[PDB]
Amino acid sequence: TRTQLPPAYTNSFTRGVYYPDKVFRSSVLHSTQDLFLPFFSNVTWFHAI
């Protein structure tokens, strides 16, 4: 009795913004090249209620 509903697609709101490394930066705009999440992307919403 596991009525699994079809997954839905939703949109994020600026998520996945962490620090690049252990370097303290203040009053300086530095750009890195790691693994982040694109803004306004499309993800999947899974329910569990």
């Binding site: 252990k22 370097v23 303290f24 203040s26 009053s27 300086v28 530095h30």
Partner: protein
């Protein structure tokens, strides 16, 4: 741990033993200049620091 400012260079470092921020300032500033009023005149020279 480390710390860099707007100049994109390490200026402050955290002490990994006593937990204290310390600023790094090398002792390499200025040079030495020579002042000579003339060889045929006299032989007294002057030292100038920047």
């Amino acid at each position: 741990q480390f710390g860099r400012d707007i100049a994109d260079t390490t200026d402050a470092v955290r002490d990994p033993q006593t937990l204290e921020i310390l600023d790094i300032t090398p002792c390499s500033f200025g040079g030495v200049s020579v002042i000579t009023p003339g060889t045929n005149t006299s032989n007294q020279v002057a030292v100038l620091y920047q």
